[PDB]
Amino acid sequence: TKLLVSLKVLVIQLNPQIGQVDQTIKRTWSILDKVTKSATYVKPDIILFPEFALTGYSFHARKDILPYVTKKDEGPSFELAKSISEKFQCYTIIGYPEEDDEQKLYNSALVVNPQGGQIFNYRKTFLYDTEMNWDCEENPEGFQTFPMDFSKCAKLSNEDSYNRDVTLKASIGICMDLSPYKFMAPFNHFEFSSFCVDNNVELILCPMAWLNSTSITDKQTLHNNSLLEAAKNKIAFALKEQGLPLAGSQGIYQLKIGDSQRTPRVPSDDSTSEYKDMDEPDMSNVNYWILRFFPFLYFKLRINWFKNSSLIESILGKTRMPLDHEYYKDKHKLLDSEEVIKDTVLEKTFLGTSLGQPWKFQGKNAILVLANRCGTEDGTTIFAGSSGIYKFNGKKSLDSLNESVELLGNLGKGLEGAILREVQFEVFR
């Protein structure tokens, strides 16, 4: 029934800029070379890249992004992922701009197996403001799940070596997917992480292009020629004081290969959002990210929610996706009916509580992998970097101080690089 798993996870962090695709690919191979020659190197089972890993992110018009979109099985991103997976006998996931046969555009992440074949293609479900510039499409399928077959990565309790295979249940969420829909939905919906708990996902993968707080996100301040020129000054000063060009760091690689140094548990304040110390993570965003996975976190007040049955209506009333989403446009889908209660309903959760248990994830394990880009674009937007690997142990605050999540390691906020962690956990079969 119980099956211990050992998994080796490699995350790549990049600073891509528009019109530098070949230079970005070359720096990638440069990083991978330094990983192999590391003192404590081990062959990874899986490798994760950020959102739009090779192309840059801030496209202003459809005509600007068109020179870089590709098919899911064609182009520089696919060929790079194919070359990498065949060389390491591993899974590789990379974010890229996609075009289909009907000339429609998506923000996507493709999956390539250890045999060099593309087994999956996920499309972004919750869109960001920038996507509207080139008329990006929402995923018609909403959030999705897929299996991943790992070889010789598991063992029984009394066994001594990992000589057993294991198929894990995985899911990909891209950047905005972790946020409330359109920044208008209720915060406590936790759409993506709820989906992951409901469907019993064991491995969560998140390519990202997530912003540091000092970024300029104001409609009034970005459209006024006088306000914007004055607004950029702060950002321009922030990077000059770090001894970096406005576009941020490139070609100087931070490596954390095989070490077991874990990220310190720290609360958020008015200092943790500052763009300083490029080799250290943005702990404001790290705390925020953990918060968006609330259903996986231990919370004392759940027992009161369960005993008082104050969430039954929410659990039963909750739909699979937001009603105005692409999901229902072309989908299509109660205590009063004569229909019976299906297994699906008993798997449903809200705020981590199900109909049968106060905390559904209690006693389970799951691994979270975030690959976020670094650097800067347009002199207005600062990406937060800080890629990392996390473990939800499911044992008995709303940040990194919560010991039901383990912070296995993070990269810094401002440097390109890579981190490898050998992750141990357990599943039930």
175 catalytic? Reply is yes
What is the spatial distance between Cα 67 and Cα 274, in angstroms, rounded to a whole number? 35
90 catalytic? Reply is no
Tell me the Ramachandran region of residue 262: left when phi exceeds 0, alpha when psi lies from -120 to 50, beta otherwise: beta
Q: Which two tokens stand for residue 164?
A: 């057993």
- How far CA 414 is from CA of 250, 269, 281, in Å, comes to 9, 19, 8
Contact of 96 with 70, CB cutoff 8 Å: yes
First CA to last CA across the chain, in angstroms?
Answer: 5
- How far CA 171 is from CA of 200, 225, 302, 339, in Å, comes to 10, 42, 26, 30
Instruction: Find the radius of gyration of the CA atoms of the chain.
Output: 21
Contact of 303 with 360, CB cutoff 8 Å: no
124 catalytic? Reply is yes
Q: Exactly one of 8, 51, 206, 406 is catalytic; which is it?
A: 51
Q: Which two tokens stand for residue 147?
A: 């299996």
211 assigned to a ligand binding site: yes
Experimental method: X-ray
What type of residue sits at position 322? P
Neighbours of 117 (CB within 10 A): 12
What is the spatial distance between Cα 344 and Cα 346, in angstroms, rounded to a whole number? 6
366 assigned to a ligand binding site: no
Q: Exactly one of 90, 136, 153, 175 is catalytic; which is it?
A: 175
Q: Exactly one of 8, 82, 124, 413 is catalytic; which is it?
A: 124
176 assigned to a ligand binding site: yes
What is the spatial distance between Cα 400 and Cα 149, in angstroms, rounded to a whole number? 31
The residues, any chain, with a CB within 8 Å of residue 186's CB and separated by 6 or more, are: 180
What is the spatial distance between Cα 184 and Cα 159, in angstroms, rounded to a whole number? 50
Residue identified by tokens 């008993």 is 346
328 assigned to a ligand binding site: no
132 assigned to a ligand binding site: no
H/E/C letters for each residue in the chain?
CEEEEEEEEEEEECCCCCCCHHHHHHHHHHHHHHHHCCCCCCCCCEEECCCCCCCCCCCCCHHHHHHHCECCCCCHHHHHHHHHHHHHCCEEEEEEEEECCCCCEEEEEEEECCCCCEEEEEECCCCCHHHHHHCCCCCCCCCCCEEEEEEEEEECCCCCCCCEEEEEEEEECCHHHHCCHHHCCCHHHCHHHHHHHHCCCCEEEEEECCECCCCCCCHHHHHCHHHHHHHHHHHHHHHHCCCCCCCCCCCCEEEEECCCCCCCCCCCCCCCCCCCCCCCCCHHHHHHHHHCCHHHCCCCCHHHHHHHCCCHHHHHHCCCCCCCCHHHCCCCCCCCCCCCCCHHHHHCCECCECCCCCCCCCCCCEEEEEEECCCEECCCEEECCCCEEEEECCCCCCCCCCCCEEEEEECCCCCEEEEEEEEEEEEEC
